[PDB]
């Protein structure tokens, strides 16, 4: 694409500069260019890809929620015309485009070349996340299939992570956190969400004794997010 003429290493360097400057759209464009070079990504590069797109889509999701709230109130109210719906639809279409872009990178060809557990689980978690973001805005006849695509990606990631990673591994923990959120607020399964968060937390607790001080800090940080959700949900 527009990054085809830039060296892979320069794209990575510029993605890191864009992160420092809080230019997340640029960051994502640089990392998309890096992925499209066709080589596998290192751990650090996968993290840069994730940070970039999660910030871009996070801004879109927050804006969509503001606009959706205004639209819902308008349908309680004076007729103000089509503008609120039109603008919510504009933001929604942009958000869906970003999700489709990330899913396209995962399908062409990040997932199929990812053989180590850490990379494969990471990419499958990402796939579940971006289908989950599509599900947040889906209202039509494909909503069930979008939800099932998220579930299927998360489930494959969970199966690999349980077999190949320790219960304190940060990717395993972040995956479980996000799949639990999927259950709670996408799949209408709050009991499954709570069970998954509690079991994940307790199994990580029992494995903390094996860790260095730095790994302990990494794992306990995510465990606290699981606890935050359990406190909110119970």
């Amino acid at each position: 694409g527009a990054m085809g003429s830039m060296e892979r290493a320069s794209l990575i360097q510029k993605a890191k500069l864009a992160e420092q400057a809080e230019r997340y759209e640029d960051m994502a464009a640089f990392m998309k260019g890096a992925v499209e070079k066709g080589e596998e990504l290192s751990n650090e590069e996968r993290n840069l890809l994730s940070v970039a797109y999660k910030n871009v889509v996070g801004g879109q999701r927050a804006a969509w929620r503001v606009l959706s709230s205004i639209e819902q109130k308008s349908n309680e109210s004076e007729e103000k015309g089509p503008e609120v719906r039109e603008y919510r639809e504009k933001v929604e279409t942009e958000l869906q485009g970003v999700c489709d872009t990330v899913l396209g990178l995962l399908d062409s060809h990040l997932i199929k070349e990812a053989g180590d557990a850490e990379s494969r689980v990471f990419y499958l978690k990402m796939k579940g996340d971006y289908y989950r973001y599509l599900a947040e805005v889906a209202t039509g006849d494909d909503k069930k299939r979008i939800i099932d695509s998220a579930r299927s990606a998360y489930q494959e990631a969970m199966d690999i992570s349980k077999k190949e990673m320790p219960p304190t591994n940060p990717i395993r923990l972040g995956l479980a956190l996000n799949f639990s959120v999927f259950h709670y607020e996408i799949a209408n399964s709050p009991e499954e969400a709570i069970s998954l968060a509690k079991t994940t937390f307790d199994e990580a607790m029992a494995d903390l004794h094996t860790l260095s001080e730095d790994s302990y800090k990494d794992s306990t940080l995510i465990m606290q997010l699981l606890r935050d959700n359990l406190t909110l949900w119970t």
Binding site: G58, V181, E185, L225, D228
Partner: peptide
């Protein structure tokens, strides 16, 4: 209080 997903 919004539920947590994996961010930073």
């Amino acid at each position: 209080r919004r539920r947590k997903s994996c961010q930073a």
